[PDB]
Amino acid sequence: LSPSDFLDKLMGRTSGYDARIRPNFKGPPVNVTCNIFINSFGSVTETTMDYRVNIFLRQQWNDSRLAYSEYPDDSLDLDPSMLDSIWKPDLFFANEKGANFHDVTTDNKLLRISKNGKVLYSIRLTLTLSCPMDLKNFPMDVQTCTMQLESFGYTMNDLIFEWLSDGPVQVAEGLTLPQFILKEEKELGYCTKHYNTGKFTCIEVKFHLERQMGYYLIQMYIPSLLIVILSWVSFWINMDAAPARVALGITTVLTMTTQSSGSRASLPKVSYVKAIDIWMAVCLLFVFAALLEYAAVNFVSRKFVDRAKRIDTISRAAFPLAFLIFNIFYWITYKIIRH
Amino acid sequence: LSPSDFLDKLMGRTSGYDARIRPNFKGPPVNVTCNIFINSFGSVTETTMDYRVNIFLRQQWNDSRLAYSEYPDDSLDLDPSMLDSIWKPDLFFANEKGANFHDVTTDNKLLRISKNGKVLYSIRLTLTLSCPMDLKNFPMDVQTCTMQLESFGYTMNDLIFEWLSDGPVQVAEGLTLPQFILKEEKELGYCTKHYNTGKFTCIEVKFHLERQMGYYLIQMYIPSLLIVILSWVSFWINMDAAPARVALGITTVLTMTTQSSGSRASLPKVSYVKAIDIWMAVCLLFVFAALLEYAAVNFVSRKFVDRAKRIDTISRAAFPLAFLIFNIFYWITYKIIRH
Amino acid sequence: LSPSDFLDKLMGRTSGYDARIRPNFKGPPVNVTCNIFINSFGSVTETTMDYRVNIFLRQQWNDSRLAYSEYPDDSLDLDPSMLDSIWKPDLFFANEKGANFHDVTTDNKLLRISKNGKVLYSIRLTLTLSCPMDLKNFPMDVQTCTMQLESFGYTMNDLIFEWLSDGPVQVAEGLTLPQFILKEEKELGYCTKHYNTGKFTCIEVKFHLERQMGYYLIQMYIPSLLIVILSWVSFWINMDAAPARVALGITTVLTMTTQSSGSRASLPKVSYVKAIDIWMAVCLLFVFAALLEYAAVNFVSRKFVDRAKRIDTISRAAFPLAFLIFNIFYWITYKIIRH
Amino acid sequence: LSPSDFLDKLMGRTSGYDARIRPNFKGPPVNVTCNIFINSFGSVTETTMDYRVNIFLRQQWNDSRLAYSEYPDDSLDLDPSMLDSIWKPDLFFANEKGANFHDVTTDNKLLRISKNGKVLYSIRLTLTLSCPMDLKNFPMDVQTCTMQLESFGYTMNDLIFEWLSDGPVQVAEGLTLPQFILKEEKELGYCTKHYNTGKFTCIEVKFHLERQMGYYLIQMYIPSLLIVILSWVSFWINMDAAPARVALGITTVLTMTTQSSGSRASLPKVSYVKAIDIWMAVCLLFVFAALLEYAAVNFVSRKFVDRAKRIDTISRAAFPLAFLIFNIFYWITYKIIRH
Amino acid sequence: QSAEDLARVPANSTSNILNRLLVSYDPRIRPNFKGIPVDVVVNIFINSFGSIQETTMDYRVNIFLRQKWNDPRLKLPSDFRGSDALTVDPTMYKCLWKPDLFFANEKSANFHDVTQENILLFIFRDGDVLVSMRLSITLSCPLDLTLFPMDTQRCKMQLESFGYTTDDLRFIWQSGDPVQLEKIALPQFDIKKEDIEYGNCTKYYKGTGYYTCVEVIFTLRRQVGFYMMGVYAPTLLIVVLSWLSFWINPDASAARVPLGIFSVLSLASECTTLAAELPKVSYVKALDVWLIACLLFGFASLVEYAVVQVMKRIDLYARALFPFCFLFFNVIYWSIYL
């Protein structure tokens, strides 16, 4: 007969099947094998510590009550309307902020009952997970964005999740992010919570987002470094030309202050110190030291002009070595040591 | 004898009909023919890689069960409230990030049954699809933003989509985007996803979005180009002058730095080096090189004038030619060979 | 007796009435006299090309199937919950982007039936209507942001919308917009859709918006024009006293570049050339021209001094004429013609 | 028999359970031991004066009519669908702005009725809680954000809330706020809203949000100190150098005022004076005071020649004393006198 | 509807014999039908008042809209004494008539549904029905920020009837403390309970009746301290700097060059940097008048430098005239735009 009528003969109000009771009741816990297939991975914002995904969640399990060997069609499938007549594992995402199904042209979910009792459930969810990023070393950071599936009111001896055998988490092939790159090293583990009541089951997949810094290396480091070079060539050459020296000093400290405090609207607003902020502050300190050493040579000037030019030449030899020492001790620290 | 009660015997209780069984069941597939009519378009954002489109989507398919012969009216339609009494193909959008129908003054859903059996279904959706944008060459790039219709749990031996013959996707005429321009040539074809559970039918459209470049040409390229040309004009004057070239050199440097530091609030906040960042860094490097290779002349001058005169006579032809070879490289790399 | 059962004796199950058959079925079409009454207006956003308006909407039409002369109470009221029993004409705003009702403290609908069958249906909608804007001439422009009301499923052979005679579209008094000023001349018109199915009625209203340039005059026209006059006054000096003339030239070019930077920082994000960016590029070009005049005078001056004073006087007479010709052409083409 | 049918036997149309009246009606109050478990804590803004939290809220209360001793199950669960067939205490957050439940795969409510009468009701809410924060001492402020639960319908004659004994509010380990740092000392107490009808019960928990002044201290404070030092070094030189004093004076005034106006667009947009504004104004005032001291000692040089030198040597020891006195009167009143 | 009974004693049996099963209490027809107008007694209680967006002209506010009227068809019988306030649950909130008010200038209003529904209804002995409901409205008030850093915005909230004229429904305030509010902190403005001025204002909509209405008018005075210690005193300091730059010697020196080229550059880079922080509103605000005046004075300083070096006799007049010419403007501007 028809799959609808045979289905309601199998799982209706009659025939002894309560949806509100788990299969294998008073026995071994069910093994809900679930996997995800993510489509979009966007808006990894730093002002709210979240990221939005749009996944396909497919979970399979067993129940002896939905078994049959009398019907021609081997895998029945019920419409997404009457999904309240089958027990479903009551999972939820342990850290999601906002999340919702999709309802374009139909309900985007599916439930198939195989002949061997294997029940297959597939949803299309949109989630906004919460990942606690740290921007301590900002333009060279590596973030771990996690996603945890968990049960809601079923203990480990009542229900357990476990990932699929092969390919439990797989992204779409053509996705890309504005700032980060989603690496191909995702880690799949268990983080089972040991709460006050019992050990509620939970599984976790963590993605590694690695930030690329071409934009910052072009438009945040190089202008300030060239400004520092100009700050040195101020007093490297112009010995006696004081109006051709004070002007370069004013302009270089002014353009460095403008570069430092007019490029913070394009950086994520946090309050702890970032790497780019340390570098900006050290460049500001260096141009300040350039202007101060000019003023010191001018002070010691007004029988001693040889000592004045000697201090000038010693500073012109010491500033590049000092900046190379800082630059090395910064780059080997942030790029190779903390990575 | 009325179209309110004729349907209650055509597809209601006193009729053999199931809204969960496709026509021609266990036979040939159902050739659903779809076509779109794009009303609005926009919100193309580089931060979340999406774009919002407000479409009239219609799809037609003929079933042998919904055919009448005794009725006087050719095409009768039922209310959208009773849209759970006809099999409708689950047509979901394979790259959406959220969709919703429209229900102003009446729900915007229409289903009309013809006399031979041709069901027509026209709805109005407000999707926000996701096209991955790649801003490698930013002020001159195209964006192939797609739209992927697909079925959800009907393989290609059950359901098959295909476009109309004449004018599948016909965008409205009065469209005007803030950044892009929708090119009037919309590519259209099949994607036909082959998952590990069957071959699922699919049809897709690709729009080409080309940038408008005039605003960046007026406000980014041309002022910096005139700045670097004026910077060459600077060191073309006599060399025996302490404040007469430092002024124009540091003027060019200050204007270049404030230009490149004020333009960082109008670009898309991505973190890989694009075309405009390369062009804004190279001109800054050039005006810095002009100021530095004047300061070196002012150093080396104090027959000691002959070497500085040779340096000036070399540099006066070195800088414009080494700029107009890079200019050729840039405008054949970004405008020509990368299309 | 009471209204709540008189409606059951008029349109209910016992009497003859149908909830999806139009008045005068298979006869002359029904003429819906539609008018609106806006309350709010704003969010005219040029980055998504859509405004938002919060309207009352009154549609009145006659149907003799509700004509009654049974008891003298001549104003029947249906509650806004059993609103699916009467026939009400479908109406969808053919350019909306998302729009919905209001449901605070009650349902915000009303349906009053009169004696002669003329019923009056008033709803309170909020609408995010789409408006294709045009910022070719930004601070001096007009927007013809329109609004259409179209039938959905009923051709012009079955239903016809028409505006009310005595001021169909009204405006709540004291309505201020942050940018525009809504005119008192609103052009009501007969749109008409001629699609492949048939011809569908479509009434429309076109508001005119005028951007008031009072802020742009005080903040971006007067300072730049002042800087152009200052750049004139720079080389208006007679002798070759260097630091004053060089000071004023560098001053004017730095402040003009900073003005251009801030103008990009505050203005709309549109990637085609606007009539404010033309007028900023030209002022930047004129300050470039004055600096180049100084550089040329210095380059020719060490017979030579006579030609130097000659070209200085010629430029001092020619630059005001050039700027006046440009300003005349600019303000006639933007403030006068395209107005 | 089945636990669902046993719930139908225990409460329904068979027994005398009335789901609209409180337990032990016409008698003593019913204490509800409540405890929360926060999962996210973010979006704490200063523009709309509210934060956003994502909690697991749990309530335990005794119900006399829900005891039983003739069933093998030690504690039954209750379906989230048939959950409005029981008494539940109306508990709302008195300072919320937007609050919603979750259902990501199923409803996230869980109701467990014990064998003696204990009832556990656990839900998962997302809340936007309105806390009013002041920024009178901004970059070292400590904001107390409260969450106050209170009854809606019943007074304290009927319903009495109280927190749990051990660990009422817990925090999910690994939280990180963008610009704050949450302290582990949560001060929880009673609230007892005294209204006109009766004293409605009210409990509350106050988190102590502390801010961390890294980005502000490195981006603003240290540049301000350096510019004040440069202003001192300006007139620390002798009067033989007429250019250098006024040059460094204009230099320090400009970099101070542009650091102020560059910081002014990254602070929270409020209208009362913050603690950073007082510092960035007084530092500008002292830089201007040093430059006006230079103007005075140039105005008096028209005790024949030491009338300027004595005042300059007095300033060269009196301005650091003024800055030190301001620092001791600032870093005490903001860092230690407002705890 | 047709269910026989469930209980006889408690506060639900009286509702079952009061409406929807017993004698017809039609919830569609108002009390005193074709008699006198019903008198609804409203009094809001504000819990939150914020997000005054100067780009959309709105403000969000959370109220407790209590409304209490007199229904003689719900006269509680004298069978009991303990049911002085017969509390009906919101499952039957639609089975009794309720006045259909609405906010005539709202934008997107919605209820609250946390852990329960937030509507409480009481039915008293003498027939007085009371409805409290928590509400989260976002009304619209036309902000006119011409006097921007010193302006006072009045924003009003008006309750109205929807379909019931003045001879059918009529709103009156409680007449004792009708608009209360908690301690609330606006980010920029300053709400004050000293001005909470309210009143009736019915509208005469043409053709169809004369609809009732009440309204509250909050007054908000935007505090000025950040702007005064921000873009007022540093900008005035820049202008005073460029004035005092006339005291440097021109004779055989080159150090007035930076004090000019950086004064004008600093004032321009303050003006057009402020131009993004201000509310994006395209008409002349008082702050913009101040900024253009300060830029005119910097331009005047540099053109005075030009005229003294294109023509002792002019500097001594400029130093004593133009810093004295600032004061007249600084008096008339703060007298007009304040």
Ligand SMILES: O=C1C[C@@H]2OCC=C3CN4CC[C@]56c7ccccc7N1[C@H]5[C@H]2[C@H]3C[C@H]46
């Ligand atoms: O009492 C609680 C609160 C606590 O909330 C943190 C999250 C949890 C997730 N699951 C879902 C509900 C919960 C649970 C199950 C059975 C009784 C009490 C109970 N809970 C929450 C609890 C943990 C564990 C479990």
Ligand SMILES: O=C1C[C@@H]2OCC=C3CN4CC[C@]56c7ccccc7N1[C@H]5[C@H]2[C@H]3C[C@H]46
């Ligand atoms: O079991 C699955 C998982 C898999 O998820 C990736 C996306 C897919 C696209 N659609 C969505 C529903 C799905 C499907 C149909 C019938 C049985 C199982 C099933 N799903 C997904 C599947 C593919 C193919 C198909």
Ligand SMILES: O=C1C[C@@H]2OCC=C3CN4CC[C@]56c7ccccc7N1[C@H]5[C@H]2[C@H]3C[C@H]46
């Ligand atoms: O067959 C169609 C598709 C077409 O879609 C573009 C939008 C239109 C808007 N109105 C609403 C529905 C529609 C219509 C009415 C009756 C039969 C078919 C039908 N439509 C759409 C149509 C046009 C015209 C009309």
Ligand SMILES: O=C1C[C@@H]2OCC=C3CN4CC[C@]56c7ccccc7N1[C@H]5[C@H]2[C@H]3C[C@H]46
């Ligand atoms: O009469 C009132 C009005 C007043 O409104 C401010 C909000 C309050 C919150 N709770 C919820 C409803 C209320 C209440 C309960 C019982 C009778 C009357 C009544 N109210 C509101 C009241 C306060 C106190 C209480």
Ligand SMILES: O=C1C[C@@H]2OCC=C3CN4CC[C@]56c7ccccc7N1[C@H]5[C@H]2[C@H]3C[C@H]46
């Ligand atoms: O018939 C109408 C249309 C008209 O729309 C402009 C808005 C108005 C606001 N109030 C609320 C609804 C309205 C009204 C009440 C009762 C019957 C009809 C009716 N309306 C609108 C009306 C005015 C007056 C009134």
Ligand SMILES: *[C@@H]1O[C@H](CO)[C@@H](O)[C@H](O)[C@H]1NC(C)=O
């Ligand atoms: C589920 O996992 C448990 C783990 O011990 C195992 O004993 C059982 O056989 C599995 N399969 C079921 C319950 O079908």
Ligand SMILES: *[C@@H]1O[C@H](CO)[C@@H](O)[C@H](O)[C@H]1NC(C)=O
């Ligand atoms: C279900 O039962 C079958 C019985 O053979 C077993 O092989 C399978 O592992 C079980 N689990 C799933 C998820 O199919």
Ligand SMILES: *[C@@H]1O[C@H](CO)[C@@H](O)[C@H](O)[C@H]1NC(C)=O
């Ligand atoms: C659908 O099209 C296919 C062609 O690929 C055809 O074989 C089949 O019969 C068609 N089915 C119907 C119902 O027209």
Ligand SMILES: *[C@@H]1O[C@H](CO)[C@@H](O)[C@H](O)[C@H]1NC(C)=O
């Ligand atoms: C109707 O079905 C028949 C298949 O036998 C064919 O004429 C045609 O493809 C169908 N019409 C459609 C799809 O519009």
Ligand SMILES: *[C@@H]1O[C@H](CO)[C@@H](O)[C@H](O)[C@H]1NC(C)=O
């Ligand atoms: C409606 O408008 C049409 C326009 O042609 C007119 O013929 C007709 O008389 C009008 N009235 C009715 C009731 O159809």
Ligand SMILES: *[C@@H]1O[C@H](CO)[C@@H](O)[C@H](O)[C@H]1NC(C)=O
């Ligand atoms: C509807 O028909 C009646 C017939 O008496 C007429 O008086 C009325 O004006 C008509 N209404 C419209 C809107 O045409």
Ligand SMILES: *[C@@H]1O[C@H](CO)[C@@H](O)[C@H](O)[C@H]1NC(C)=O
């Ligand atoms: C509830 O019942 C338990 C039963 O042991 C008792 O201990 C407790 O005091 C009661 N009250 C509360 C508030 O838990």
Ligand SMILES: *[C@@H]1O[C@H](CO)[C@@H](O)[C@H](O)[C@H]1NC(C)=O
């Ligand atoms: C609730 O708390 C009160 C204390 O106010 C106590 O007297 C009572 O025993 C507790 N339990 C119940 C069930 O009322």
Ligand SMILES: *[C@@H]1O[C@H](CO)[C@@H](O)[C@H](O)[C@H]1NC(C)=O
């Ligand atoms: C308040 O409302 C209107 C406003 O003019 C007025 O007619 C009425 O009498 C006033 N007083 C009341 C309702 O007590």
